[PDB]
Design a protein around this ligand. Structure first.
Ligand SMILES: *C(=N)[C@H](C[C@@H]1CCNC1=O)NC(=O)[C@H](CC1CCCCC1)NC(=O)[C@@H](NC(=O)C(F)(F)F)[C@@H](C)OC(C)(C)C
Ligand SMILES: *C(=N)[C@H](C[C@@H]1CCNC1=O)NC(=O)[C@H](CC1CCCCC1)NC(=O)[C@@H](NC(=O)C(F)(F)F)[C@@H](C)OC(C)(C)C
Lengths: 306, 306
């Protein structure tokens, strides 16, 4: 019993974190086999930030311009390449602590775990969602760039995020591990805003199922509703539409609790309409949307990793 | 910017987790040097749970009754000992992934990180506080016993918690790593309840400082109040008294924000009196108390580990 924003154990990822230094700019890199991934804006200078041309910036670099620490050990870069917005620095040493790993590009709504790092040294680990506006409500200070987000699946680290920038609204923007930004953001210091965010409806539903699994049951009703009619209420309250594919993902949870999916939809409808009346679901006074149906099942059933 | 329930990276602790099996009972153990710590109720049987006498239960065991997996590798117990409520199983192999480590017994109010484990395999990592009633609002399923809680301080893992049991109210009880329960709980399957909990006042204050550091500032006032008068309002709302020693710990934060400690006390007083008016502090619709002043400074300043 109990329900926490639970992050994957971060050991597999801690042993891949390294410092990368070009000129006056120090940020984090990720070390897999004999390659170090980091945000390409490490090659920028204080005056190269307004509209940087990374292609000319990078033709002008030689390998020894890249200082890479793995701890107190000094790695040697033997070649560099740019893939979208990430630097791939081929180094002479293969990381022996490389886990089995994949690069995945995740859909808005999925969650991942973030290992926040500074100078190649992990600081902390927390759980994030990729918001519908392809930003993340993260916790990131100066020098946090290059920290990654990831999921673990038995033994494989699916890296899904690298951190690049903080937006004026305080949310965060970055890329998959092939350097494509999530969302329409660019690695330029120009005006960019986050864009209207919505609530991840299917996750709110999965969290309400977690509640039923953990003993809260006050928010239910004998009402039901159609999918069409549910979406009409959702969009008013700035929720994402719920698809039939969402309903199907929420199947196992529906069946474990005996609450039909369109029934939990009627519960949420009433919750959005009437509020929580100053009660709390799972110790939360807000409808929580950063838990996927996978997450709920991982936590309320007890899935491990090797 | 941003503020998350941030757990310490758990790599150092993942490499200490092991499975421990006596008879029909499998639970987690912690492996430091050549010793495996686990809850002593692993030697219990289904009928030995009402008022177990662990001394007679343990004189009757021989070493080979203890099956210890470190992964797919099978450890050999060469001796056993009971220290309070924990088994110390001396094994023939020293754990090579033993970090520098301390056992500390923490005061209510401190927080730690929990690595939830099943069959010796870590499942997830989240951040807990030791509540004033010496329970923890954790997330724990069957077989989670032996999972530890811990803090990291540069390179040293200060283990502070082992998990033993879930209480009827769904909160969790366990011990320090020398086997003394936090609180008045015993490892017996008899009636025990959690006891009235209070809110960790100094932490609520430190979180409000985190808010000021991260841009929220709506909850302040030109009011001030005396310590005496603040405690009078606190105890009404079931908050802990705030001591002068609390005020001093909150010094660095006071000085980083220029909000006198007794001024943030006047802010909280008004917040407890008038509510939040359906606003949110740091994305939270509740006064959050599971962040120590240390935590806020770690996260809003960026402290790392090696
Ligand atoms: C990298 N380590 C760092 C991480 C930032 C710093 C504080 N919190 C973070 O998440 N990233 C940057 O500082 C980054 C610099 C880089 C320069 C070349 C172009 C690509 C980005 N920039 C930012 O995060 C800034 N934001 C923007 O410029 C944006 F366009 F609005 F996104 C950031 C410094 O600006 C404020 C002050 C946070 C609004
Ligand atoms: C150990 N792996 C396990 C972890 C529990 C199971 C589910 N969530 C957890 O945190 N611990 C126990 O099941 C433990 C068994 C042990 C037996 C000998 C005496 C010491 C404890 N017992 C409990 O957590 C039970 N609680 C109690 O008996 C208590 F006295 F109220 F604390 C638990 C199984 O009881 C309910 C059903 C959770 C109320």
């Amino acid at each position: 019993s109990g329900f926490r924003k639970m992050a994957f154990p971060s050991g597999k990822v801690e042993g891949c974190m390294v410092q990368v230094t070009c000129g006056t700019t120090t940020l984090n890199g990720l070390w897999l086999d004999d390659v170090v991934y980091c945000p390409r804006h490490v090659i920028c200078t204080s005056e190269d930030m307004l509209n940087p041309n990374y292609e000319d910036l990078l033709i002008r670099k030689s390998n020894h311009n890249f200082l890479v620490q793995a701890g107190n050990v000094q790695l040697r870069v033997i070649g560099h390449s740019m893939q979208n917005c990430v630097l791939k620095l081929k180094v002479d040493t293969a990381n022996p602590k490389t886990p089995k790993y994949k690069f995945v590009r995740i859909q808005p709504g999925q969650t991942f775990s973030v290992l926040a790092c500074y100078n190649g040294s992990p600081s902390g680990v927390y759980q994030c969602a990729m918001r519908p506006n392809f930003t993340i409500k993260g916790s990131f200070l100066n020098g946090s760039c290059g920290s990654v987000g990831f999921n673990i699946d038995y033994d494989c680290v699916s890296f899904c995020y690298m951190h690049h920038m903080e937006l004026p609204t305080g949310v965060h923007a970055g890329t998959d591990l092939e350097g494509n930004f999530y969302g329409p953001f660019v690695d330029r210091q120009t005006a960019q805003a986050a864009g209207t965010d919505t609530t991840i409806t299917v996750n709110v539903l999965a969290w309400l199922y977690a509640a039923v699994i953990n003993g809260d049951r006050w928010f239910l009703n004998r009402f039901t509703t159609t999918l069409n009619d549910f979406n009409l209420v959702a969009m008013k309250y700035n929720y994402e539409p719920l698809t039939q594919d969402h309903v199907d993902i929420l199947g196992p949870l529906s069946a474990q609790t005996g609450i039909a999916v369109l029934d939990m939809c009627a519960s949420l409808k009433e919750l959005l309409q009437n509020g929580m009346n100053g009660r709390t679901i799972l110790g939360s006074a807000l409808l929580e949307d950063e838990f996927t149906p996978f997450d709920v099942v991982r936590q309320c059933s007890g899935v491990t990793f090797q």
